[PDB]
PDB file of all heavy atoms in Angstrom:
ATOM      1  N   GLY A   1       0.808  -1.218   0.000  1.00 58.33           N
ATOM      2  CA  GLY A   1       0.000   0.000   0.000  1.00 58.33           C
ATOM      3  C   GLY A   1       0.838   1.264   0.000  1.00 58.33           C
ATOM      4  O   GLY A   1       0.618   2.156   0.819  1.00 58.33           O
ATOM      5  N   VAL A   2       1.781   1.356  -0.934  1.00 60.78           N
ATOM      6  CA  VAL A   2       2.744   2.454  -0.952  1.00 60.78           C
ATOM      7  C   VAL A   2       2.982   3.016  -2.348  1.00 60.78           C
ATOM      8  O   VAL A   2       2.848   2.312  -3.351  1.00 60.78           O
ATOM      9  CB  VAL A   2       4.115   2.028  -0.377  1.00 60.78           C
ATOM     10  CG1 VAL A   2       4.024   1.807   1.125  1.00 60.78           C
ATOM     11  CG2 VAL A   2       4.644   0.783  -1.081  1.00 60.78           C
ATOM     12  N   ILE A   3       3.332   4.298  -2.385  1.00 58.84           N
ATOM     13  CA  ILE A   3       3.856   4.940  -3.581  1.00 58.84           C
ATOM     14  C   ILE A   3       5.268   5.411  -3.249  1.00 58.84           C
ATOM     15  O   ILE A   3       5.480   6.104  -2.253  1.00 58.84           O
ATOM     16  CB  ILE A   3       2.964   6.111  -4.039  1.00 58.84           C
ATOM     17  CG1 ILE A   3       1.654   5.562  -4.613  1.00 58.84           C
ATOM     18  CG2 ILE A   3       3.669   6.961  -5.091  1.00 58.84           C
ATOM     19  CD1 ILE A   3       0.595   6.609  -4.889  1.00 58.84           C
ATOM     20  N   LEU A   4       6.226   5.024  -4.086  1.00 59.31           N
ATOM     21  CA  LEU A   4       7.642   5.262  -3.820  1.00 59.31           C
ATOM     22  C   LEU A   4       8.186   6.312  -4.776  1.00 59.31           C
ATOM     23  O   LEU A   4       8.177   6.110  -5.985  1.00 59.31           O
ATOM     24  CB  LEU A   4       8.434   3.963  -3.991  1.00 59.31           C
ATOM     25  CG  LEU A   4       7.829   2.694  -3.385  1.00 59.31           C
ATOM     26  CD1 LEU A   4       8.594   1.468  -3.857  1.00 59.31           C
ATOM     27  CD2 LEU A   4       7.813   2.770  -1.865  1.00 59.31           C
ATOM     28  N   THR A   5       8.662   7.426  -4.233  1.00 60.08           N
ATOM     29  CA  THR A   5       9.272   8.477  -5.041  1.00 60.08           C
ATOM     30  C   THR A   5      10.785   8.426  -4.835  1.00 60.08           C
ATOM     31  O   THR A   5      11.277   8.707  -3.739  1.00 60.08           O
ATOM     32  CB  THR A   5       8.723   9.866  -4.659  1.00 60.08           C
ATOM     33  OG1 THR A   5       7.292   9.860  -4.745  1.00 60.08           O
ATOM     34  CG2 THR A   5       9.282  10.956  -5.568  1.00 60.08           C
ATOM     35  N   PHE A   6      11.511   8.059  -5.891  1.00 63.07           N
ATOM     36  CA  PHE A   6      12.967   7.913  -5.835  1.00 63.07           C
ATOM     37  C   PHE A   6      13.657   9.150  -6.400  1.00 63.07           C
ATOM     38  O   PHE A   6      13.296   9.624  -7.478  1.00 63.07           O
ATOM     39  CB  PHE A   6      13.412   6.683  -6.625  1.00 63.07           C
ATOM     40  CG  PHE A   6      12.958   5.385  -6.026  1.00 63.07           C
ATOM     41  CD1 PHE A   6      11.860   4.710  -6.540  1.00 63.07           C
ATOM     42  CD2 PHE A   6      13.631   4.835  -4.946  1.00 63.07           C
ATOM     43  CE1 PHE A   6      11.442   3.512  -5.985  1.00 63.07           C
ATOM     44  CE2 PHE A   6      13.221   3.638  -4.388  1.00 63.07           C
ATOM     45  CZ  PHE A   6      12.123   2.976  -4.906  1.00 63.07           C
ATOM     46  N   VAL A   7      14.658   9.651  -5.677  1.00 64.33           N
ATOM     47  CA  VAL A   7      15.377  10.863  -6.077  1.00 64.33           C
ATOM     48  C   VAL A   7      16.891  10.691  -6.024  1.00 64.33           C
ATOM     49  O   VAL A   7      17.418   9.974  -5.174  1.00 64.33           O
ATOM     50  CB  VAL A   7      14.991  12.081  -5.207  1.00 64.33           C
ATOM     51  CG1 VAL A   7      13.540  12.465  -5.453  1.00 64.33           C
ATOM     52  CG2 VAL A   7      15.236  11.812  -3.727  1.00 64.33           C
ATOM     53  N   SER A   8      17.577  11.368  -6.941  1.00 61.88           N
ATOM     54  CA  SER A   8      19.035  11.360  -7.001  1.00 61.88           C
ATOM     55  C   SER A   8      19.522  12.443  -7.953  1.00 61.88           C
ATOM     56  O   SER A   8      18.729  13.059  -8.667  1.00 61.88           O
ATOM     57  CB  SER A   8      19.549  10.012  -7.511  1.00 61.88           C
ATOM     58  OG  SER A   8      19.428   9.929  -8.922  1.00 61.88           O
ATOM     59  N   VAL A   9      20.830  12.670  -7.955  1.00 61.96           N
ATOM     60  CA  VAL A   9      21.482  13.357  -9.063  1.00 61.96           C
ATOM     61  C   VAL A   9      22.277  12.288  -9.806  1.00 61.96           C
ATOM     62  O   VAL A   9      23.400  11.952  -9.424  1.00 61.96           O
ATOM     63  CB  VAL A   9      22.388  14.515  -8.603  1.00 61.96           C
ATOM     64  CG1 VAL A   9      23.006  15.218  -9.805  1.00 61.96           C
ATOM     65  CG2 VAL A   9      21.588  15.510  -7.777  1.00 61.96           C
ATOM     66  N   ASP A  10      21.667  11.741 -10.853  1.00 60.64           N
ATOM     67  CA  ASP A  10      22.268  10.651 -11.609  1.00 60.64           C
ATOM     68  C   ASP A  10      23.485  11.139 -12.387  1.00 60.64           C
ATOM     69  O   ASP A  10      23.477  12.240 -12.940  1.00 60.64           O
ATOM     70  CB  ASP A  10      21.251  10.041 -12.573  1.00 60.64           C
ATOM     71  CG  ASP A  10      21.741   8.745 -13.183  1.00 60.64           C
ATOM     72  OD1 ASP A  10      21.907   7.765 -12.428  1.00 60.64           O
ATOM     73  OD2 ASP A  10      21.964   8.705 -14.411  1.00 60.64           O
ATOM     74  N   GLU A  11      24.524  10.309 -12.429  1.00 63.68           N
ATOM     75  CA  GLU A  11      25.781  10.684 -13.080  1.00 63.68           C
ATOM     76  C   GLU A  11      25.661  10.801 -14.603  1.00 63.68           C
ATOM     77  O   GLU A  11      26.471  11.480 -15.235  1.00 63.68           O
ATOM     78  CB  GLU A  11      26.911   9.716 -12.694  1.00 63.68           C
ATOM     79  CG  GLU A  11      26.758   8.287 -13.202  1.00 63.68           C
ATOM     80  CD  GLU A  11      27.920   7.393 -12.802  1.00 63.68           C
ATOM     81  OE1 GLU A  11      29.071   7.876 -12.765  1.00 63.68           O
ATOM     82  OE2 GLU A  11      27.680   6.197 -12.525  1.00 63.68           O
ATOM     83  N   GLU A  12      24.660  10.141 -15.186  1.00 64.59           N
ATOM     84  CA  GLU A  12      24.377  10.258 -16.621  1.00 64.59           C
ATOM     85  C   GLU A  12      23.204  11.194 -16.927  1.00 64.59           C
ATOM     86  O   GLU A  12      23.248  11.942 -17.904  1.00 64.59           O
ATOM     87  CB  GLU A  12      24.091   8.883 -17.230  1.00 64.59           C
ATOM     88  CG  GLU A  12      25.310   7.981 -17.323  1.00 64.59           C
ATOM     89  CD  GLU A  12      25.082   6.754 -18.190  1.00 64.59           C
ATOM     90  OE1 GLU A  12      24.401   6.860 -19.234  1.00 64.59           O
ATOM     91  OE2 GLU A  12      25.600   5.678 -17.832  1.00 64.59           O
ATOM     92  N   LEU A  13      22.166  11.152 -16.093  1.00 64.73           N
ATOM     93  CA  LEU A  13      20.896  11.830 -16.392  1.00 64.73           C
ATOM     94  C   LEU A  13      20.660  13.135 -15.626  1.00 64.73           C
ATOM     95  O   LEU A  13      19.715  13.864 -15.934  1.00 64.73           O
ATOM     96  CB  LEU A  13      19.723  10.872 -16.142  1.00 64.73           C
ATOM     97  CG  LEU A  13      19.555   9.708 -17.125  1.00 64.73           C
ATOM     98  CD1 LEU A  13      18.303   8.914 -16.775  1.00 64.73           C
ATOM     99  CD2 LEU A  13      19.490  10.186 -18.572  1.00 64.73           C
ATOM    100  N   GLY A  14      21.507  13.432 -14.645  1.00 69.66           N
ATOM    101  CA  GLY A  14      21.333  14.627 -13.823  1.00 69.66           C
ATOM    102  C   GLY A  14      20.234  14.421 -12.796  1.00 69.66           C
ATOM    103  O   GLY A  14      19.842  13.283 -12.531  1.00 69.66           O
ATOM    104  N   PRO A  15      19.719  15.521 -12.213  1.00 70.10           N
ATOM    105  CA  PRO A  15      18.668  15.412 -11.202  1.00 70.10           C
ATOM    106  C   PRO A  15      17.505  14.564 -11.703  1.00 70.10           C
ATOM    107  O   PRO A  15      17.072  14.728 -12.845  1.00 70.10           O
ATOM    108  CB  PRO A  15      18.241  16.867 -10.984  1.00 70.10           C
ATOM    109  CG  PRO A  15      19.445  17.663 -11.347  1.00 70.10           C
ATOM    110  CD  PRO A  15      20.041  16.928 -12.510  1.00 70.10           C
ATOM    111  N   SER A  16      17.019  13.661 -10.855  1.00 68.18           N
ATOM    112  CA  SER A  16      16.059  12.647 -11.278  1.00 68.18           C
ATOM    113  C   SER A  16      14.974  12.401 -10.239  1.00 68.18           C
ATOM    114  O   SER A  16      15.256  12.320  -9.044  1.00 68.18           O
ATOM    115  CB  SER A  16      16.788  11.334 -11.562  1.00 68.18           C
ATOM    116  OG  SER A  16      17.542  11.420 -12.758  1.00 68.18           O
ATOM    117  N   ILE A  17      13.733  12.297 -10.714  1.00 68.07           N
ATOM    118  CA  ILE A  17      12.609  11.848  -9.899  1.00 68.07           C
ATOM    119  C   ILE A  17      11.903  10.727 -10.651  1.00 68.07           C
ATOM    120  O   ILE A  17      11.448  10.926 -11.776  1.00 68.07           O
ATOM    121  CB  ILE A  17      11.590  12.975  -9.628  1.00 68.07           C
ATOM    122  CG1 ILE A  17      12.260  14.161  -8.930  1.00 68.07           C
ATOM    123  CG2 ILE A  17      10.441  12.456  -8.767  1.00 68.07           C
ATOM    124  CD1 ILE A  17      11.448  15.438  -8.992  1.00 68.07           C
ATOM    125  N   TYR A  18      11.825   9.552 -10.031  1.00 71.10           N
ATOM    126  CA  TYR A  18      11.095   8.416 -10.596  1.00 71.10           C
ATOM    127  C   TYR A  18      10.195   7.808  -9.526  1.00 71.10           C
ATOM    128  O   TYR A  18      10.664   7.468  -8.438  1.00 71.10           O
ATOM    129  CB  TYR A  18      12.071   7.379 -11.155  1.00 71.10           C
ATOM    130  CG  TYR A  18      12.730   7.839 -12.437  1.00 71.10           C
ATOM    131  CD1 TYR A  18      13.786   8.746 -12.414  1.00 71.10           C
ATOM    132  CD2 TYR A  18      12.279   7.389 -13.676  1.00 71.10           C
ATOM    133  CE1 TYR A  18      14.380   9.186 -13.586  1.00 71.10           C
ATOM    134  CE2 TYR A  18      12.869   7.822 -14.854  1.00 71.10           C
ATOM    135  CZ  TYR A  18      13.917   8.721 -14.805  1.00 71.10           C
ATOM    136  OH  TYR A  18      14.511   9.152 -15.970  1.00 71.10           O
ATOM    137  N   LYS A  19       8.904   7.686  -9.838  1.00 70.48           N
ATOM    138  CA  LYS A  19       7.901   7.303  -8.843  1.00 70.48           C
ATOM    139  C   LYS A  19       7.186   6.003  -9.206  1.00 70.48           C
ATOM    140  O   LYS A  19       6.815   5.789 -10.357  1.00 70.48           O
ATOM    141  CB  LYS A  19       6.884   8.430  -8.648  1.00 70.48           C
ATOM    142  CG  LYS A  19       5.881   8.179  -7.530  1.00 70.48           C
ATOM    143  CD  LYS A  19       5.171   9.455  -7.107  1.00 70.48           C
ATOM    144  CE  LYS A  19       4.139   9.897  -8.129  1.00 70.48           C
ATOM    145  NZ  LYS A  19       3.500  11.176  -7.718  1.00 70.48           N
ATOM    146  N   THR A  20       6.982   5.164  -8.192  1.00 73.05           N
ATOM    147  CA  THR A  20       6.414   3.823  -8.339  1.00 73.05           C
ATOM    148  C   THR A  20       5.092   3.733  -7.585  1.00 73.05           C
ATOM    149  O   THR A  20       4.934   4.365  -6.544  1.00 73.05           O
ATOM    150  CB  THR A  20       7.389   2.779  -7.757  1.00 73.05           C
ATOM    151  OG1 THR A  20       8.590   2.764  -8.537  1.00 73.05           O
ATOM    152  CG2 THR A  20       6.780   1.372  -7.731  1.00 73.05           C
ATOM    153  N   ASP A  21       4.155   2.939  -8.102  1.00 73.73           N
ATOM    154  CA  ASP A  21       2.859   2.732  -7.441  1.00 73.73           C
ATOM    155  C   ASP A  21       2.503   1.236  -7.356  1.00 73.73           C
ATOM    156  O   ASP A  21       3.220   0.402  -7.911  1.00 73.73           O
ATOM    157  CB  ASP A  21       1.765   3.541  -8.154  1.00 73.73           C
ATOM    158  CG  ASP A  21       1.583   3.147  -9.608  1.00 73.73           C
ATOM    159  OD1 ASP A  21       1.674   1.943  -9.933  1.00 73.73           O
ATOM    160  OD2 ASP A  21       1.323   4.054 -10.427  1.00 73.73           O
ATOM    161  N   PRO A  22       1.403   0.888  -6.653  1.00 72.78           N
ATOM    162  CA  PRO A  22       1.024  -0.525  -6.490  1.00 72.78           C
ATOM    163  C   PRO A  22       0.591  -1.278  -7.757  1.00 72.78           C
ATOM    164  O   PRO A  22       0.449  -2.501  -7.714  1.00 72.78           O
ATOM    165  CB  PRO A  22      -0.144  -0.458  -5.498  1.00 72.78           C
ATOM    166  CG  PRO A  22       0.093   0.796  -4.738  1.00 72.78           C
ATOM    167  CD  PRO A  22       0.587   1.752  -5.781  1.00 72.78           C
ATOM    168  N   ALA A  23       0.369  -0.563  -8.859  1.00 77.07           N
ATOM    169  CA  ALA A  23       0.026  -1.195 -10.134  1.00 77.07           C
ATOM    170  C   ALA A  23       1.265  -1.686 -10.879  1.00 77.07           C
ATOM    171  O   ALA A  23       1.146  -2.409 -11.866  1.00 77.07           O
ATOM    172  CB  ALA A  23      -0.759  -0.226 -11.008  1.00 77.07           C
ATOM    173  N   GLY A  24       2.447  -1.294 -10.405  1.00 75.86           N
ATOM    174  CA  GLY A  24       3.702  -1.595 -11.087  1.00 75.86           C
ATOM    175  C   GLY A  24       4.063  -0.559 -12.139  1.00 75.86           C
ATOM    176  O   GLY A  24       4.950  -0.785 -12.959  1.00 75.86           O
ATOM    177  N   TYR A  25       3.375   0.579 -12.119  1.00 78.48           N
ATOM    178  CA  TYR A  25       3.642   1.665 -13.058  1.00 78.48           C
ATOM    179  C   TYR A  25       4.751   2.553 -12.501  1.00 78.48           C
ATOM    180  O   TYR A  25       4.857   2.743 -11.287  1.00 78.48           O
ATOM    181  CB  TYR A  25       2.357   2.470 -13.311  1.00 78.48           C
ATOM    182  CG  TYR A  25       2.532   3.793 -14.037  1.00 78.48           C
ATOM    183  CD1 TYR A  25       2.401   3.878 -15.422  1.00 78.48           C
ATOM    184  CD2 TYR A  25       2.796   4.967 -13.333  1.00 78.48           C
ATOM    185  CE1 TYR A  25       2.547   5.088 -16.083  1.00 78.48           C
ATOM    186  CE2 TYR A  25       2.945   6.180 -13.985  1.00 78.48           C
ATOM    187  CZ  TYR A  25       2.818   6.237 -15.361  1.00 78.48           C
ATOM    188  OH  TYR A  25       2.964   7.443 -16.012  1.00 78.48           O
ATOM    189  N   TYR A  26       5.591   3.072 -13.392  1.00 78.34           N
ATOM    190  CA  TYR A  26       6.574   4.087 -13.021  1.00 78.34           C
ATOM    191  C   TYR A  26       6.895   5.000 -14.202  1.00 78.34           C
ATOM    192  O   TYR A  26       6.729   4.615 -15.364  1.00 78.34           O
ATOM    193  CB  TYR A  26       7.855   3.439 -12.472  1.00 78.34           C
ATOM    194  CG  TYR A  26       8.918   3.150 -13.516  1.00 78.34           C
ATOM    195  CD1 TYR A  26      10.105   3.880 -13.553  1.00 78.34           C
ATOM    196  CD2 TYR A  26       8.740   2.144 -14.459  1.00 78.34           C
ATOM    197  CE1 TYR A  26      11.080   3.620 -14.502  1.00 78.34           C
ATOM    198  CE2 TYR A  26       9.710   1.877 -15.413  1.00 78.34           C
ATOM    199  CZ  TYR A  26      10.876   2.618 -15.430  1.00 78.34           C
ATOM    200  OH  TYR A  26      11.840   2.353 -16.374  1.00 78.34           O
ATOM    201  N   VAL A  27       7.344   6.212 -13.892  1.00 78.66           N
ATOM    202  CA  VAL A  27       7.746   7.179 -14.911  1.00 78.66           C
ATOM    203  C   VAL A  27       8.634   8.250 -14.281  1.00 78.66           C
ATOM    204  O   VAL A  27       8.602   8.456 -13.066  1.00 78.66           O
ATOM    205  CB  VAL A  27       6.513   7.827 -15.595  1.00 78.66           C
ATOM    206  CG1 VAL A  27       5.798   8.791 -14.654  1.00 78.66           C
ATOM    207  CG2 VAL A  27       6.904   8.532 -16.889  1.00 78.66           C
ATOM    208  N   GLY A  28       9.437   8.913 -15.109  1.00 77.40           N
ATOM    209  CA  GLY A  28      10.238  10.048 -14.669  1.00 77.40           C
ATOM    210  C   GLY A  28       9.395  11.306 -14.590  1.00 77.40           C
ATOM    211  O   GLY A  28       8.416  11.444 -15.326  1.00 77.40           O
ATOM    212  N   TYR A  29       9.779  12.221 -13.700  1.00 75.63           N
ATOM    213  CA  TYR A  29       9.036  13.461 -13.479  1.00 75.63           C
ATOM    214  C   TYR A  29       9.941  14.696 -13.493  1.00 75.63           C
ATOM    215  O   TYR A  29      11.089  14.641 -13.051  1.00 75.63           O
ATOM    216  CB  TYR A  29       8.303  13.400 -12.136  1.00 75.63           C
ATOM    217  CG  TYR A  29       7.139  12.437 -12.101  1.00 75.63           C
ATOM    218  CD1 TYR A  29       7.328  11.103 -11.756  1.00 75.63           C
ATOM    219  CD2 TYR A  29       5.846  12.862 -12.399  1.00 75.63           C
ATOM    220  CE1 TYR A  29       6.265  10.218 -11.717  1.00 75.63           C
ATOM    221  CE2 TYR A  29       4.776  11.982 -12.363  1.00 75.63           C
ATOM    222  CZ  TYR A  29       4.992  10.660 -12.020  1.00 75.63           C
ATOM    223  OH  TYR A  29       3.943   9.770 -11.980  1.00 75.63           O
ATOM    224  N   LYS A  30       9.404  15.805 -14.004  1.00 73.89           N
ATOM    225  CA  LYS A  30      10.028  17.125 -13.862  1.00 73.89           C
ATOM    226  C   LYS A  30       9.943  17.510 -12.392  1.00 73.89           C
ATOM    227  O   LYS A  30      10.899  18.004 -11.793  1.00 73.89           O
ATOM    228  CB  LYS A  30       9.279  18.181 -14.683  1.00 73.89           C
ATOM    229  CG  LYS A  30       9.148  17.885 -16.167  1.00 73.89           C
ATOM    230  CD  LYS A  30       8.256  18.908 -16.854  1.00 73.89           C
ATOM    231  CE  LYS A  30       8.131  18.613 -18.339  1.00 73.89           C
ATOM    232  NZ  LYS A  30       7.038  19.388 -18.988  1.00 73.89           N
ATOM    233  N   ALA A  31       8.754  17.291 -11.844  1.00 73.18           N
ATOM    234  CA  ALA A  31       8.474  17.433 -10.427  1.00 73.18           C
ATOM    235  C   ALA A  31       7.231  16.598 -10.175  1.00 73.18           C
ATOM    236  O   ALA A  31       6.562  16.190 -11.121  1.00 73.18           O
ATOM    237  CB  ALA A  31       8.227  18.890 -10.075  1.00 73.18           C
ATOM    238  N   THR A  32       6.919  16.324  -8.917  1.00 72.67           N
ATOM    239  CA  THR A  32       5.740  15.519  -8.616  1.00 72.67           C
ATOM    240  C   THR A  32       5.261  15.730  -7.192  1.00 72.67           C
ATOM    241  O   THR A  32       5.975  16.287  -6.359  1.00 72.67           O
ATOM    242  CB  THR A  32       6.003  14.014  -8.868  1.00 72.67           C
ATOM    243  OG1 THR A  32       4.759  13.311  -8.959  1.00 72.67           O
ATOM    244  CG2 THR A  32       6.857  13.395  -7.760  1.00 72.67           C
TER     245      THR A  32
END
């Protein structure tokens, strides 16, 4: 029962936000 928002400054991609939900869906975000 969770939504996971992952954050980093990726060495290839720069600042990153990627979010996961219980359906198994994920996508990158400008902000969220």
